[PDB]
């Protein structure tokens, strides 16, 4: 649908959509930009991530509201409407996750050769499989969970070899993989260990950073600390 718009115009419009809090539009513009077939710059990758995280974040929040209402109903024997509407929102959410995973597979990941881009996209792949796992209940749920795990693990392996422990994408990846362990894989000890080791190794590397890099890294470290406080 965006095939007739210039790549640069799609990027410009994605930035305007962000300013206007029109995240569905922002995601459609960035999907159009990805489909031009060129690699994405650092800023462009962030626009893609922000757009879809906001879209799927609203869907996940709505799914959780409806799932809670449905659970309370299954404990007055009301009709099919709550389940039907939860299923409608769930199918929409799955469609957005499949769209993002499709962009990563065709062909963002295979062309990403630098560590920063490859880790970024593998983290995204883990995240969107994690969102699929949050709603999964059927024959393929274990395979969805393993797909998230595998993507996060490859990203971790690259990040530990190629990036300093304070690198914001490395930190955000570890944060999200720890959430995966706690919330999805039923491995709270692994989640806590990962968050603590990540925090401590970043702390020891802050001395190398400029004031601006220090601000970026410590912001994510605080999220790790917030989870450790919640979990311990």
């Amino acid at each position: 649908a965006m095939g007739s718009m210039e790549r640069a115009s799609l990027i410009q419009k994605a930035k305007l959509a962000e300013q206007a809090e029109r995240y569905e539009d922002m995601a459609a513009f960035m999907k159009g930009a990805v489909e031009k077939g060129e690699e994405l710059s650092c800023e462009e990758r962030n626009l893609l991530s922000v757009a879809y995280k906001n879209v799927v974040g609203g869907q996940r929040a709505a799914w959780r509201v409806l799932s809670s209402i449905e659970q309370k109903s299954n404990e007055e024997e009301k009709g099919p409407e709550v389940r039907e509407y939860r299923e409608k929102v769930e199918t929409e959410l799955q469609g957005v996750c499949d769209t993002v995973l499709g962009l990563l597979d065709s062909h963002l990941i295979k062309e990403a050769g630098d560590a920063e881009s490859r880790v970024f996209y593998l983290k995204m792949k883990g995240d969107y499989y994690r969102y699929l796992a949050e709603v999964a209940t059927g024959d393929d749920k274990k395979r969805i969970i393993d797909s998230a795990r595998s993507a996060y693990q490859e990203a971790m392996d690259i990040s530990k070899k190629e990036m300093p422990p304070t690198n914001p994408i490395r930190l955000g990846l570890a944060l999200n993989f720890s959430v995966f362990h706690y919330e999805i894989a039923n491995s709270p000890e692994e989640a806590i260990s990962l968050a603590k080791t990540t925090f401590d190794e970043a702390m020891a590397d802050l001395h190398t950073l400029s004031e601006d890099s220090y601000k970026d890294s410590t912001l994510i470290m605080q999220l790790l600390r917030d989870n450790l406080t919640l979990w311990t």
């Binding site: 922000v50 995280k53 944060l175 999200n176 706690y182 919330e183 999220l223 917030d226 919640l230």
Partner: peptide, 8 residues
């Protein structure tokens, strides 16, 4: 509550 994943 739910834990914090990455967010800006």
């Amino acid at each position: 509550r739910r834990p914090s994943s990455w967010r800006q």
